[PDB]
Ligand binder design. Structure first.
Ligand SMILES: Cc1nc(NC(=O)N2CCC[C@H]2C(N)=O)sc1-c1ccnc(C(C)(C)C(F)(F)F)c1
Length: 855
């Protein structure tokens, strides 16, 4: 009717292509995916609408809290006998008069326990605490130290500004929104293990094979990246008539193919491959493909080594002009189905010590997921299946020991997975990579993922959990139903879940899968769809604004380029879309009225856009009066977000161990095709600008801005904020540390800025470390700059598996740095976990003393 036709237009605006364009898809899987089996996401809507409007407040404004309630030991010493001073504001007045209160509370006070003391001070479930200057609310019962804002105040010794609002005022801001089902929501066999035959797949011809010496098709059965059998060749034929009509015979027995087994295609010319394509041998209904099939082949491999592409996308190229290879897979005069779990469980049951072996299990468990496991070690893990259960973290290595060529082994391993003890979520994430493709294995991780991930940990790893959706071979699966439910229960999760999918829409390998996912999110996200629509039109206004600035690239600032930006932002169509919404880079920051005098274009080779937005809050001055965000268009920001996510994980590990590393990872998001946003850090200047364009001017600026008892802190933190970025630069192999890539805050805290590429491709810093000494090396303060570095990598080395699992997931992301696992070998190269950290230290000095010529 009218409302359904109305709703379907902004949904197509928020995703970029119409909803009706999904109705013309002929694929039964796509239409079946959109049907009511996936619209059970109404359970998310029913959950968030259950205890309205409190549940709608929790959904719209989810708490930004910490994973661990317990405060670090060194941070607990920053308090005053377990007390934190907070300023409580109660504003009841005609227009703008504000009342200020100061409280003496514990650091772990309940958010509604602050009200009791604040009201008691005023009067020597009615109010809520909002952070002054942003839309952050203390709605959930969590310790104040657990909340990110108050803990960050203890991080830097800042003053926590919290103000009082009546809960009825926030509730009135959340009108009820209901979920309505769409039009398309209305609406024996033969086992695979009973047919005694070998796998036999016919190659007929290539419709539009890319050729301009002979052409042959290279095929192989794969389960992840390992070969499920010997690859089978095809007779070479002339390029003019690539007609093959050959029934290739595979050494793999038909009642031996695993559920996730798939056939990989490769048209090769003599031996350079021409095109690649993977075909799932089964379907989402557990049906082995039969009859004639047509597949359009993807473009020339993936810049990889071997001919086939075992890991990738299982499907036909959306472009119909791509080389199309038609195949006649099977003909058994019946419908052949992969057996149910009950048959498999009985099949496995039918078939069925304190030596160094128990100590060898621990050694294999602690090894990193790139140390190749030898066959004798793989056979070693085979015979200790009943003992590998005692060590839950051996499961990733056990799943590579089992051979998927054998029906009895895979059936035996299935019974292990169901009774396998739950593991840590960080380890369970590796089970969702390109390897480990078995649906029971792939679904085991999700069950532990949904039980042990917190909302903030999910927020840190959300960029990783999205990228592993592509490693799933079907549109409907256990992982997406976990991710979709999370996005429709938390606005903060849903905000970044939406923007991460939408950023990956220009990629036709995932546009079909992500487009269906976005539609299921946009249909049930509630009133946030119009907020998201405002952000989408605000960003797409800037995307065309930056693109039209790229037309006049050869121009200077304070000129045609600068005057075009000034005049084009005063236009009511431009200006209305560019205010009164929530910042894409932070859902709690309202990008209100613009400041045309405070928005400019940087005079750099990229020319990004400095954009300044007022803070429309009655108490905006208590945090910040303006939002500064860098909108740049032309360079990919996916590498930047990954590196900045490593920094956050790196500093969190160091902080929890009593190492007061105080590095600052600035906000970063990717919103489209190499388009993104950067959270500006104010009160910070590039070193290249500090030295106006001598090797002592850097220390002078820090000295005159910190005079008296505060001079030590500008030096105490400068050493700690420079040590953390030298280790992080070398561990991650980040590029040249240009003077323009580094900025230092007013109070000595410095950080690195141009990140991106990594793992490959008399200093004014030192005089500051020695507190202005001419020879820093001989000074005592230099030993603190080195002893703290030495105590640091042990935290990274003890937690190197996390930095490996999180890197194994971006292979299917299109980022050139992480094409293969060989690019993650740099992590174990610069950390050396196979060695001992008694001897891994010596490798670190030999690298710092070679580039810096001693020290
Ligand atoms: C996180 C961050 N904070 C900044 N702060 C200021 O620029 N400030 C802070 C106040 C004065 C002003 C200045 N020019 O001194 S810049 C910045 C940043 C982050 C990432 N890339 C960049 C650039 C400039 C290299 C790029 F590529 F975007 F153009 C900048």
């Amino acid at each position: 009717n009218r409302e359904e036709k109305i709703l379907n237009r902004e949904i197509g605006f928020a995703i970029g292509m119409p909803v009706c364009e999904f109705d013309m898809v002929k694929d039964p899987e796509v239409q079946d995916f959109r049907r009511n089996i996936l619209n059970v996401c109404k359970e998310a809507v029913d959950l968030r609408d259950l205890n309205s409007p409190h549940s709608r407040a929790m959904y719209v404004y989810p708490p930004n809290v910490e994973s661990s309630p317990e405060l670090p030991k060194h941070i607990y010493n920053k308090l005053d006998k377990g007390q934190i001073i907070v300023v409580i504001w109660v504003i009841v007045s005609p227009n703008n008069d504000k009342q200020k209160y100061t409280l003496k509370i514990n650091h772990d006070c309940v958010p509604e326990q602050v009200i009791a003391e604040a009201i008691r001070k005023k009067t020597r479930g009615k109010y809520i605490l909002k952070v002054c200057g942003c839309d952050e609310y203390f709605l959930e019962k969590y310790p104040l130290s657990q909340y990110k804002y108050i803990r960050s105040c203890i991080m830097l010794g800042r003053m926590p500004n919290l103000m009082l609002m009546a809960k009825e005022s926030l509730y009135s801001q959340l009108p009820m929104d209901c979920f309505t089902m769409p039009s398309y929501s209305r609406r024996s066999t033969k086992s695979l293990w009973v047919i005694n035959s070998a796998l036999r797949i016919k190659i007929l011809c290539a419709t539009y094979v890319n050729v301009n010496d002979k052409i042959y098709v290279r095929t192989g059965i794969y389960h992840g990246g390992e070969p499920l059998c010997d690859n089978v060749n095809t007779q070479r034929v002339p390029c003019s008539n690539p007609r093959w009509n050959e029934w290739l015979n595979y050494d793999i027995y038909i009642p031996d193919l695993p559920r996730a087994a798939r056939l990989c295609l490769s048209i090769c010319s003599v031996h350079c491959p021409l095109a690649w394509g993977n075909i799932n041998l089964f379907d989402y209904t557990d049906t082995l493909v039969s009859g004639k099939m047509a597949l359009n082949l993807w473009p020339v491999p993936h810049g990889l080594e071997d001919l086939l592409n075992p890991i990738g996308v299982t499907g036909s190229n959306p472009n119909k002009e791509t080389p199309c290879l038609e195949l006649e897979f099977d003909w058994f005069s019946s419908v052949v189905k992969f057996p149910d779990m009950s048959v498999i469980e009985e099949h496995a049951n039918w078939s069925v010590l304190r030596e160094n072996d128990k100590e060898q299990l621990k050694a294999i468990s602690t090894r990193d997921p790139l140390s190749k496991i030898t066959e004798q070690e793989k056979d070693f893990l085979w015979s200790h299946r009943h003992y590998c259960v005692t060590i839950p973290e051996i499961l990733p290595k056990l799943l590579l020991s089992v051979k998927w060529n054998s029906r009895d082994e895979v059936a035996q391993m299935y019974c292990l997975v169901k009774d396998w003890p739950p593991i840590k979520p960080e380890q369970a994430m590796e089970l969702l990579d390109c390897n480990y493709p078995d649906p029971m294995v792939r679904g085991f991780a999700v069950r532990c993922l949904e039980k042990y991930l917190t909302d903030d940990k999910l927020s840190q790893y959300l960029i990783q959990l999205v990228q592993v959706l592509k490693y799933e071979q079907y549109l409907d699966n256990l992982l997406v139903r976990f991710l979709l439910k999370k996005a429709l229960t938390n606005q903060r999760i849903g905000h970044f879940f939406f923007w991460h999918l939408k950023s990956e829409m220009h990629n036709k390998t995932v546009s079909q899968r992500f487009g269906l996912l976005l539609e299921s999110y946009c249909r049930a996200c509630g009133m946030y769809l119009k907020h998201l629509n405002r952000q989408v039109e605000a960003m797409e206004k800037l995307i065309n604004l930056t693109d039209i600035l790229k037309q006049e690239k050869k121009d200077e600032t304070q000129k045609v380029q600068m005057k075009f930006l000034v005049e084009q932002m005063r236009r009511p169509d431009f200006m209305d879309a560019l205010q009164g919404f929530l910042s894409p880079l932070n859902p709690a920051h309202q990008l209100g009225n613009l400041r045309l005098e405070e928005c400019r274009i940087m005079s750099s080779a990229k020319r990004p856009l400095w954009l300044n937005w007022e803070n429309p809050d009655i108490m905006s001055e208590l945090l910040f009066q303006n939002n500064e965000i860098i909108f740049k268009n032309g360079d990919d920001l996916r590498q930047d977000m990954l590196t900045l996510q490593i920094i956050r994980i790196m500093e969190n590990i160091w902080q929890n161990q009593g190492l007061d590393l105080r590095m600052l990872p600035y906000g970063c998001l990717s919103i489209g095709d190499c388009v993104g946003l950067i959270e500006v850090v104010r009160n910070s200047h590039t070193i290249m600008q500090i030295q106006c364009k001598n090797s002592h001017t850097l220390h002078q600026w820090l000295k005159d801005k910190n005079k008296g008892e505060i001079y030590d802190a500008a030096i105490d933190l400068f050493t700690r904020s420079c040590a953390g970025y030298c280790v992080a630069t070398f561990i991650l192999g980040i590029g040249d540390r240009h003077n323009s890539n580094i900025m230092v805050k007013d109070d000595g805290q410095l950080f690195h800025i141009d990140f991106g590429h990594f793992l490959d491709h008399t200093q004014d810093f030192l005089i500051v470390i020695s507190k202005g000494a001419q020879e820093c090396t001989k000074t005592r303060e230099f030993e603190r700059f080195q002893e703290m570095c030495y105590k640091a990598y042990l935290a990274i080395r003890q937690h190197a598996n996390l930095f490996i699992n999180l890197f194994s997931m971006m292979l299917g992301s299109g980022m050139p740095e992480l094409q293969s696992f060989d690019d993650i070998a740099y992590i174990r190269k610069t950390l050396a976990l196979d060695k001992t950290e008694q001897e891994a230290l010596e490798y670190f000095m030999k690298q710092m003393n070679d580039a810096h010529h001693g020290g």
